[PDB]
Structure formats: C-alpha cells, structure tokens
C-alpha cells in the first residue's frame, strides 16, 4: 500500500545507483516487494555488483512461479515458489531473506521455503552498485504494479516519487496520484 | 578535576593530565576500564563475556596489570619491533604487574561531529607486549580523536589450541572483538562516535587487524582499518600446526593425555606462571602459539578468504617501511665490509630451507633468487650483499604480502591507500648504513617527538622529526575522521602533494619522508618476482 | 698512370684512381689478383692449391666475378645485414657474373716505411656476398693502410661436408687461409708489411675470423683480429649436423647413394649452377652449409676450444650494436601499438622451442625469460614489448656470446678491446624506434659517408656521420698499426682513453655521438644468459 | 761452446722477463743447452705463465737422470734419459723439441727419446711470462756450468752477457772469461 508504481505499454525501468564511495557489501540481505501482474515471465528486481564482479541477485517470475536467483561467487543458487498460483491478478507480497548461502522465501501467508545448498559456499555479496526495477534491460519487460521495495533500509520506491538525484526513471513507468 | 563519566555498567573516574607541549589541549585519561570478566579459573580457555556491573563509582587512574608473559625468555627475535629488542630492559618496566585478569583498556579523550575512536592493537609477536607502553595522549589532543589502547590475552593463555572443540583457540582475537563491542556500545557516553571506529596496529597486531576484517564476528563493530607493517598472509601470521606445539607444551608442563579435553582440563588446573615461563621454540620464521584457522573466528586460510572476496568493504590504509629485515642481517652488522660471497650463499640457502624446503624446487629456486638479489654492476662490493640480504628479507616477508593484500582489497572496490615510510629517528645503537626498521613508524604516529625522548625511545628528535610526526598524525587522524587522508584538515613539501588511491592497474602510493612524492610502483621488479614468477618454480 | 708491381708469380697492372674528396690522397687498386688455382673439375670439394705463374703482364683492373650463389631464393633473412636485405635489388647487381673461378682478391695500396695490411672477411651468412661490394679505398687513403678484400667459395661449393673423409668440409675457411698465405708471402712487393696483417669482418664473416683464431693452419699468417657483431659460439656460427643436410641436397639434386664417396663423386659431375639453385632449409636460427668441426681446420667445437686456451695470443677488437635483432620483430613493425601480450608470449615460446627445445626445462625456462625481459613498472605499454623482444634477441645471439668470448680471450692475457655502436645512419624505410641494426657499423668503417650515398647505402650522411666515420676509421687504423686504438694517430673523442676489456671490470667504449668509457654492458642480462640459464 | 756461465756455492738465479704486452704463446717449444755438472737432484730451466694459468715447463736432474716435465693443461708429461748417466762432469748438450703433446728429447749423440701420449691433449703453452735459470726458488738449487740456453730463437745466456734491460741476475751466477 506504499508508493505503488504502474507499468505501462512498451516497458520501463527504475534505476538506483549507490554513491561510488558508499557501495555496501552485505553478508545478509532482505528483499521485500508487493506486486500485482498477470505476466507469465518477468524480471522484477535485479541487483548487480560493480564492474566485472559476477555477484548478483534477481527476483523473477518463470512460468508463472516467482523465484529468487542469486550468484554469490561459487554457483548460481535459485529458490523458487512453485507450489502455488501467484500471477492471478491479485495483490501478492514476497519477502526473501538471504543469510550467507542459506536462503528463505515467503509469499503472502503460504509456508516459508528454505534452501540450504550443499558444499562450502561463499557468503559475501560484493560491492552492490545498482538496483534495477522492471527488468527492461534483462529482456523480460514488466507490465503490472509494484509497491514497497524495502532493501536493507533503502526504500527505493519511497524515494522514487520524491525525485531523488540518484533515482532514474526511464520508460513508461507511471505513478498513481 | 576528575570528570567522572557514566557507562552502561556503572560510572568511572578519570584524570585530566596536562601535556608538555603548548599547542595541545588537555586530555582526559580513563586508565583501566574493564571490558570483560576475568578469565582466571574455569573460564580460562573460554571466549570472553560481558563484565559485571559495579555499584557506586569505579576508580580508574592507574595503568591496569599486564597479561602474563615471559619477556626474559627465548622470544621470536625477528618479528619484534627493533625498538623493543634494543631497549629490552626498559620494556620490562611496563610488564611488571603481569596478572591473568588483564582484560582492561585505557581511553584518552581530547577536550564536526562527535570524536572518532581509534583502537590500537599492539604487539610484535603474539607472546609479548602490553598497551601501557604507548601513551596515546599526544595523538588524541592533536587530532581531536579518542584513542583507545587495550590489553588482551597473549601466547599460551590466549592462543593455545588443539584443533578440536576441547580448545578451539583464538582467545586473544575474541578478546579484541569484545573490546570492540564494548567500544561500540559504550563510547557515546565518553563523547566518541560509535560509527567511526578506526582500528590500527603495527607488527603482529597489524596481522590481527587483517584477521578482524575477515571475521564475521566483527561485522558492524568498526568501519576502517590502518594496517602498518603487517598482513594476514605472511609466514608468521597464523599457526597451521597448533596441535603439535600444544602437545609439546603439554608434555613439557607435565600432562599429555591422548584425549584433548583431559589435557586441556589439566592445563586449566595449572598456574599461569608455570605454563607461561616454559620455553617452546617454533620453527624459524613461524610461530608456536597464535591465530588458528578453525572456522568460527577465521573461517579458512586467510590467503584464500581474500581471493574470493570474503570481507565487508573496509577502508584500508596499508604501509611498508623501507628496510624491515634489519634483524635478518645481524651476525654481520659489526664488520668493516658486508657479507662474504661464501656467506651470502649460506643465508639464502638457509632461508629457502626454512621457508620452502621443497625437494623439487630447491635448486632452481635457490639459484634464481640468488641471481635476482645481487647487484651485477657491483658483483664484488661486499656491502651491497648485506644490503641485498636485508632487501630480500623485507621483500619476501613485508612488502610482497602487503602489496598482495592491497591488490586483493582494491580488486573488490574498497579504498586502499598505500604508504611507504623512509625517515627514521637517529637511534643510539643503530648502524649508520641501516634505515627505517620494523616498528620505526610508531614514534611518529603516537607523537613521541612532540614530547621528547622517553625511556623506550631515547633518540634525539630534531625539527624535521617533529614536522614528520605532525604530518603523519594529521594523515592518520584525517583517515579516522573522513576515510580520506586529505579531506578534513589540510596540511600545514607535504602541502601540495595529494595522496591517491591504490588501483590495481596503476599502483599509486605515497612516499612518506623528508621529500614526499606520489610515486607509481613500489619495487615493481622484486614484487612481481615474488608474486608472479616464484609460484611457477 | 698504371703502376706495375711484380709478385712472386708474375707482374700485375693496376690503376691510380683518385677519390672525390679533397683531403684523401689517391690509391692504387689491383682489383682481380688471383691467389689459388680455380676449383673447376676434380679440384672441386678440395682444399685450394697455390696458383700458377703467368708469363707476361696480367691486367688487374676489372672487379673479378663473384662465387656461385642465389640471392633471389631461400636465404636466412635473420642473420643477414639490414642493408643487404633492404637494398637487395642493388646488392644483386654486384653478383651478376657468378663463376666457379671466383678465387680472387683486391688490394688498395695508398699513396714505418712498410704499411699495415687489413684483410676483410665478408659474408653476412655463408650463402651470399662478395668482396666487390666493399670499395675499401677511402679506408686505405685515410688511415694509410693496405685494405685487401677477397672472394672465397660460398654456400654449397665451399662448405658442403659429410663428416667422413669423402668431404671434410670448410673449403671456404681453407680458401681464406690460402689468401692469407698469399698475402703473407707476397705483400712485401706492394709496400705492405707481412708482420702486421689484421683480419676483420662483420656478420658471419666475423665468425670466420674467430674460427681462424683457433685453427693451427693460420699459425703465423696474421697477428691481430677485429671481430664485430660475430662470434664462433653463437647458434648460427657452426654446422653441427652436416651429414643430414648434405644427404638432403644429394637427394634433391638427383643422386643420393648410401656411399659418401660415391655421392660426392656424383656431385662433382653436376654443374655449379644446378646445386646452387636448389634450396635446403635449415632449422630456424641455424645454418645448413657452413663451417664444420672436423679436426683439420677446427679441431673441436669452438666453445670448448677457447675454454682450454687453444689460441695463440691474437689482439682482439670485439664489439656489438645496441639493437641487432631488428628482423626478429618484423611482422609487428607496421602496427599502431607494439606486440600484444598474447603475441609476446607466443614469440618467446617459439624462441625457446627453436633454440633450446629441452623437454625438461620447458616451462621453468620460458617463464623466467618471460619475466626477465619485461619492464614491470610500465607493464602494459604494448610498445615497450617490441623493444624488449628486440633486446632479447640481441642479448641472446650477439651480446652474450661476444661478452663470453671477450672474457675467454682476456682471461689468458691477450688484449681485448670491447666496443658498442649506437649511432646509425638515418635511412628511409627504417622505423623511427629502431636503432643501429646488424651491419650498420660497416658504412662508417669503410668511409662511405666521406664519399656520399651509394646504391647499397641510400641514406644521406650529414656532418655528424662524417665525423663519426673519421673517428671509427681512426680507431680501426690505429689498431691495425699498433694493436692499440689510441697510440699512433690522436683524435668529445679527445678526452676518452679506450681501456682493455678486463674480466674483473668489463671496461668498454661506447662509440657514438656522445662517447664514454663505460663499466659494464648490460650486466644483468649478460649475467642472466651466462650464469643462470645454464642452471635451468 | 757459447757464452759459458758458472754457478758457485749456494747457487743463484738469472731471470729474463718478457714485457707485459709481449708475452709469447707458442704451439711448438724448442730448448737446447750445453752443461757440465755432477749433481743428482737439481732444476735447471723453469718456464712459467702469468697469474692463474697452470702451464709450465721444467728441466730437472733427478736420481742422476736428466729429464723434462711440462704441463700444457691436461696433465704433467715427463720424459727422462733413464738409460744413461750424464752427471759425470763432462760437457753434455741436451735438446728438446715439443709439438703439442708430442715430445722428443735428445742428449749428445744418443738416440732421441720420443713421447706420443694417448687421449685428447692440449697443445698451447699459454702466455709465457718469465724464464728462470738456476732453480733456487724451486727447492733444488743448481751448481755447475751452462752454455747457450736456446729457447725458441732466444739466446738467453748471450743476451744476458750482453746486459739487456730485461735480464736480471741474483746470487752466485758468474761469467766465464
Ligand atoms: C546456514 O545454515 C546452517 C544450518 O543451520 C548453519 O550451520 C549456518 O551457520 C547457516 N549459515 C548462515 C550464513 O547463516
Ligand atoms: C582512587 O583510588 C585510590 C586507590 O584505590 C585512592 O587512594 C584514591 O583516593 C581514589 N581517588 C579518589 C577517591 O578521588
Ligand atoms: C643525542 O646526541 C648526543 C650528543 O651528540 C649523543 O651522544 C646521543 O647518542 C644522541 N642520542 C640519540 C639517540 O640521538
Ligand atoms: C691488358 O689490357 C690492355 C688494354 O687495357 C690490352 O690491350 C691488353 O691486351 C691486355 N693484356 C692482357 C694480358 O690481358
Ligand atoms: C637527409 O634527409 C633528411 C630527410 O628528412 C633531411 O632531414 C636531411 O636534411 C637530409 N640531409 C641532407 C644532407 O640532405
Ligand atoms: C703428434 O704426432 C701425431 C702423429 O701423426 C700427429 O697426428 C699429431 O698431430 C701430433 N701432435 C701435434 C700437437 O701436432
Ligand atoms: Ca562474492
Ligand atoms: Ca694450455
């Protein structure tokens, strides 16, 4: 019920760029978003490292099922909610908590999904640089509504309506009211 | 006056010591503030816990007792700072009240937000040194920063480990982390800023810094780091064979049970002086009791943890002295000429035998590092063989690991500032041919020249020494304030030089000395030899 | 004025050509004097014999024919001098009348009583060249010395060998020694001195000079030597497997019998033009037909011989240039930036494969000679990779052997003077980054700048080049006169005293526009190649 | 008989030193001298090289037998007139022709002793420095009469009598006449 942003025809994208001297590297991450769309394939939020590093975190809908795919350095680990129908046009909420190599996913009120990949896994997400909302550059444009991107205390959607210097709006992204 | 201050565990009373110089304000000293419960009996060889609150007012005006140690024993005489092993009789004055319950810390508060904190991790090895040797009061008044100097468990009582859960080890590291936690949750009462805690140290303490970066225990406790003359990847940084020396000590003391827990309990039942005054000699260029790679405090080999980027983007200020292996060439420091060609082929062979010992690459590596470290234009000089021996030891132990850690920290986009220290105070027994040795930057960082010679530092300081001390103290305090040695306080040839970062593509550094200049590559040939060719042999 | 001088075999008629320059006096050229019986029939593949007296007066005015060769074919371009390969069209003009009767020598007598003699042993490689290209008349008129340039059997006809007694080999060296014998027993008639015969040469010819020092055939024939940019211990100075290439040539020509004597007898029947034109490609940085260790002329391999002092105290004037491997880096001389890393490591790997080829020391050696030859302070220049590749080739092939042979000669108390050449004539097609390449000290020694540009040397020569040519010619002629480049004729070049190359302190002179007597030429890399590479 | 010299009690040494620039190296060595003495252990002619080089040539009377021992680089080669007695006080002329490893030693009219050692042999006598007559420094001083020490065209005794600038005399070496 926060600063809900409307995607329109064609596509759009929201970019949050950290200051070059204050790019944070976190051992644990928390990604929360409420959304409403009927797309069968989409990329909602994609978090990238700086230049060259292969560290990334992406939230995406594959075959209608929402899931988080992140690469922390060893292998690409994906935890996906597949035992439900979520792209039915209703307002859903998804919360993802990552602690080192362990991952936890929750959607609405359905029971949590835990992922514990085998072997010794790197734990540090190195030098986050940009938050990407919409997945325009990923190849799957988004057509729907998003609300409340809480990411380690940096609500990008909250500042998007405030015309912050670091926030960039490119495309047909629209804001209610 | 005695400005009592209230902490989360009670109230403490300090002092208002007045400094000798006329350009430094008064400094309030709280000496002996505890930060962890005394690990005397059944709590020995256990990680520290929070202290006990005291009713009323605690009285903190005297230097706290030192940790148990055997200064007059077979210390590792290479890794220690030169001023420590020269004035060893004066250094025993501070270690006079050695008691097991040594977990205390001393705060120096000067009198544009709240003041930053600078924690100092002392040490030359892991079996010696106490925080009372350094009066961090000149640095506090000059930089308007709070300076904290602690005491932590050393040697047998602080780093003994077996490998299993009977004694995991790294009790000194957990003591330092507990001190950082106490600072984080109790410094705002003293006027300090709990979000600008810079942690710095020289020598073995510096290694602790580079091991506190990789420990997930110290996540949000500090934000910056200043590691001078020390790394976590040298040969004497960690202990990869703790069980062997633990069993040797257990057999020497009088109990060696095949079950680790039984022997650990027996050791817990023995007096500290009895198991500290024993002599266990490690292999050359190694340590007996030190940090151990277990999985809790240090998850993996430090050389592997930083290659994979397992750190949380701490601003770093690394540094190297010109010649630190001054104790490598000591048997030949009292000769008219340098080392003979028959002896230059002997020290190098012993060096390779003690550091590599590989049956395969023992004759190809020895010949190539004999060829590289000899001045071919002066093949028969004599002195320029002692000089190259000193340069060899310095390059292998202190320069190459420092540059390696700088590159690994910079490749993951964390601001790294590299410095090289050249000037040194004209000591008494120091050879004329010698230069800035190991630990010869502490006098300048701690503002010794601004108060004159002490018992520990008896050189005579000129105006140039005072200028250099002011410059390096300004650099360090600027780093502790804003994370950039030039932003807050402009210099006042040091004025017009701008210190640049350390990018891996172009390794800019600063050549601190009487004639500073931002150079571009420090000993590129030998550093490349030690990092890129030797692994191929 | 055609002066007639009577030799030990007859009378020859010369000329009295006068030079274009004004200071230099006129010379007398006996171009075309023979020194051995021509090896046409059964004398082919045989050591030379003394000539036959001719009744009357023999005209010596025309430049004699060159020895059979084929420039427009498969030649080793790496070892050839730069001016020879660049101006190959003009160089091929001199070799036009190639005949098997090519044993002739040319004297240039100028106009204390006796004069010194300087023989020139030409040859960039062992397949090509002739003495007519080097008009040694300015050197004779300036330094007042008798310059003698000869022709000797080249390539297949003068160096073919089988190892056995069917063809011993080294017919070119035997021809050169016969020419030296003729000079020794006949130069007194022309005014020269039979006691001051210097021999000098550049390129592979200089190798001959060194191979003429260790041979007991040339015992008292000459007294000095000037070996520039040449050695007898480099990779391409001696042929170590001549039987293989001889058998390949026999198979290619048309007769390859299992018996060496029968094969040689069949070869003698072939024309001199048939076997020259066939190509026999040797391995890279090696030679096919050249001097062979046999026990007659060269007793053992030259590297061993100079270790155990098997030489007869000949004063030496050895030297090198700054960059001679200019043709090592040729495919990358027409690029915006220098050699890329993927190409630098490839060239180094090919270098090690072709020159060492040791299965054991393969990746230890390649890595260390990669690390040694790269400036780490400016690692990613690109352009400072061409310079290091050129320096690597120069150091391995020309500087390290020259320093090794200078030390070996100086260790047995025989004077050695080491020189390094830096200034080079500004050509047209030579890159700006390049420097004095192989054989770029030849215009200055022979006084080309004091006559002007010729077909072989198309640069112009300014006043600086004339001054340097005068200085270098003075040094060479002083060495010829007294064995010391300072004594007879005094000269930036007046305050410099050239000092002997002592093994303990490797003193040398740095010839150039700014000369200086330096102390150690590339001590690091020379010590690398002489004292570390053998340990891997 | 040439310019005879007499060695008195205690003996002496006469030395001819080549100039440092004109030290001769020679493949073939020739020696010839007449002498008269009755000694049994002595050294007469000593040829040395400059510093470092091991090349040398010795003429010595041992056990009443006169012989020559030379080191050219491989090993010492010695040839002696074993089948005769020479120290009978009469005038005996000894000559010695060297060619690399081959050596021919002749005395008076007795048949020439020839030596052709086997194996690879060095040949060059490198950088001869001084010629020594008397053998006092060697350890076996000589006392007798000598005449015409021929050495590769150098009449050493004749030029010594001529009082050259490169000849020195010490001890009891005296001229006849
Ligand atoms: C992941 O879960 C395992 C299992 O409880 C635990 O041992 C480990 O510490 C967890 N890792 C993190 C980074 O929380
Ligand atoms: C502080 O403590 C000392 C000894 O514990 C005591 O003598 C002194 O009076 C105290 N300071 C006060 C009470 O101000
Ligand atoms: C200080 O100067 C005095 C007098 O020159 C000298 O004796 C003393 O050793 C000096 N001390 C130091 C450490 O400079
Ligand atoms: C020499 O040349 C002259 C003309 O130059 C000619 O008349 C004469 O026949 C020639 N003699 C010989 C022997 O070649
Ligand atoms: C030689 O040619 C170059 C071409 O640039 C010119 O600079 C120089 O002046 C010429 N020298 C003479 C003497 O013509
Ligand atoms: C010694 O005599 C043999 C006999 O033929 C000869 O082959 C050899 O060359 C001679 N030695 C020398 C050094 O000439
Ligand atoms: Ca990572
Ligand atoms: Ca010899």
Swiss-Prot record, chain B:
Disulfide cross-links: 67-102, 255-266, 425-459
Keywords, sorted A to Z: Cell adhesion, Cell membrane, Cell projection, Disulfide bond, Glycoprotein, Membrane, Phosphoprotein, Postsynaptic cell membrane, Signal, Synapse, Transmembrane, Transmembrane helix
Localization of this protein: Cell membrane; Postsynaptic cell membrane; Presynaptic cell membrane
Domain of life where this protein originates: Eukaryota
Gene Ontology biological process: gephyrin clustering involved in postsynaptic density assembly; inhibitory synapse assembly; insulin metabolic process; jump response; locomotory exploration behavior; modulation of chemical synaptic transmission; neuromuscular process controlling balance; neuron cell-cell adhesion
Glycosylation sites recorded in the entry for this protein: 59, 97, 460
Molecular function terms, GO-annotated: cell adhesion molecule binding; identical protein binding; neurexin family protein binding
GO CC terms: axon; cell surface; dendrite; dendritic shaft; dopaminergic synapse; excitatory synapse; GABA-ergic synapse; glycinergic synapse
Topology relative to the membrane: Single-pass type I membrane protein
Chief location of this protein within or outside the cell: membrane
Tissue specificity: Detected on hippocampus neurons, especially at inhibitory synapses. Detected in retina, in the outer and inner plexiform layer. Detected in pancreas, in islet of Langerhans beta cells (at protein level). Expressed in brain, spinal cord and dorsal root ganglion. Detected in brain, and at lower levels in pancreas islet beta cells.
Extracellular membrane side: 1-537
Role, per record: Transmembrane scaffolding protein involved in cell-cell interactions via its interactions with neurexin family members. Mediates cell-cell interactions both in neurons and in other types of cells, such as Langerhans beta cells. Plays a role in synapse function and synaptic signal transmission, especially via gamma-aminobutyric acid receptors (GABA(A) receptors). Functions by recruiting and clustering synaptic proteins. Promotes clustering of postsynaptic GABRG2 and GPHN. Promotes clustering of postsynaptic LHFPL4.
Family: Belongs to the type-B carboxylesterase/lipase family.
Assembly behavior: Interacts with neurexins NRXN1, NRXN2 and NRXN3. Interaction with neurexins is mediated by heparan sulfate glycan modification on neurexin. Interacts (via its C-terminus) with DLG4/PSD-95 (via PDZ domain 3). Interacts with PATJ. Interacts with GPHN. Interacts with MDGA1 and MDGA2. Found in a complex with MAGI2 and IGSF9B, where it interacts with MAGI2 (via WW 1, WW 2 and PDZ 2 domains). Identified in a complex of 720 kDa composed of LHFPL4, NLGN2, GABRA1, GABRB2, GABRG2 and GABRB3. Interacts with LHFPL4; leading to mutual regulation of the protein level and synaptic clustering.
Official protein name in the record: Neuroligin-2
Organismal lineage: Eukaryota, Metazoa, Chordata, Craniata, Vertebrata
Name of the gene this protein is made from: Nlgn2
Full-sequence portion shown in this chain: 40 to 608 of 836
